[PDB]
């Protein structure tokens, strides 16, 4: 292939859907590294670390969302253009629980200075192992595709 | 003041916006939540939290990424 695939385990909502590349829901509730105000898109490395950031991490098991696997394709040449951020060279407080101004700060300056349309960072869960922001302002977003594809139904709360 | 019903309505208005209320009981799902660890804030209960105007802020930005996918 000449994509990297990235994963969200996303619902849709009134006025964005799960395959959602404008960052609208982000924008609306901030995140570990955005404010509130400034979209943004979250995808995590694999899907099983997309579990854990979304259900697992804020206790949402349980609930009776429709749920769906994205897929986010990413041309190579622009995961190539992207920065990483790691442990070691991340300011020391990005891991904070609740994320605080460190990461936030750190993500706004990122998205506002639109140095990359691309940022890996590490996951508070698993630093190891990435997730990727898009900054959908930012002209080399373009190329970017994002479908449903299948609906996400591993609940650790389900009743069978 | 705890303030459960504005909650209960923000979960409520979450599944009928994303998913199905059909049978769904909010406040009991609401109950369990807020009396469990929450891994997002650090381990610590929602519940305890609910005694200051910034804490129940903390809350409902952690309920409202259930649906808006950000990370936290």
Same mark, same amino acid.
């Given at each position: ?16 859907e ?11 509730? @901030?995140?570990?590294? =955005?404010?509130?105000? *400034?979209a &943004? ?6 899907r /099983?670390? +997309? ?8 206790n949402?098991? @349980?609930?009776?969302? =429709?749920?769906?696997? *994205?897929? &986010?394709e ?5 995961? /190539?253009? +992207?920065?990483?951020?790691t ?14 101004? *460190?990461? &936030? ?10 140095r ?26 373009k ?18 | 003041?705890?303030?459960?019903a ?25 109950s ?5 660890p929450?891994?997002?804030?650090g ?13 129940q ?16």
């Amino acid at each position: 292939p000449v994509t990297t695939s990235f994963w969200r385990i996303a619902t849709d909502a009134r006025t964005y859907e799960a395959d959602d590349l404008s960052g609208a829901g982000a924008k609306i509730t @901030g995140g570990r590294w =955005n404010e509130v105000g *400034v979209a &943004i898109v979250y995808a995590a490395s694999s899907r /099983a670390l +997309a579990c854990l950031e979304t259900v697992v991490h804020l206790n949402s098991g @349980g609930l009776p969302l =429709n749920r769906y696997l *994205v897929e &986010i394709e990413v041309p190579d040449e622009v995961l /190539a253009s +992207a920065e990483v951020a790691t442990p070691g060279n991340l300011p020391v407080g990005w891991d904070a629980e609740p994320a605080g101004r *460190v990461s &936030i700060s750190f993500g706004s300056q990122w998205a506002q200075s639109q140095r990359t349309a691309l940022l890996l960072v590490p996951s508070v869960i698993v630093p190891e192992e990435t997730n990727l922001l898009i900054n959908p302002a930012h002209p080399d977003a373009k190329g970017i595709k994002a479908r449903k594809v299948r609906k996400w139904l591993y609940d650790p709360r389900m009743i069978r | 003041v705890l303030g459960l019903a504005k909650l209960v309505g923000q979960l409520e208005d979450m599944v009928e916006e994303s998913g199905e209320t059909d049978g769904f009981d909010a406040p009991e799902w609401l109950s369990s939540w807020l009396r469990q660890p929450l891994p997002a804030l650090g381990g610590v209960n929602p519940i305890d939290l609910l005694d200051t105007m910034e804490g129940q802020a903390v809350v409902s930005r952690a309920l409202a990424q259930i649906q808006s996918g950000a990370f936290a």
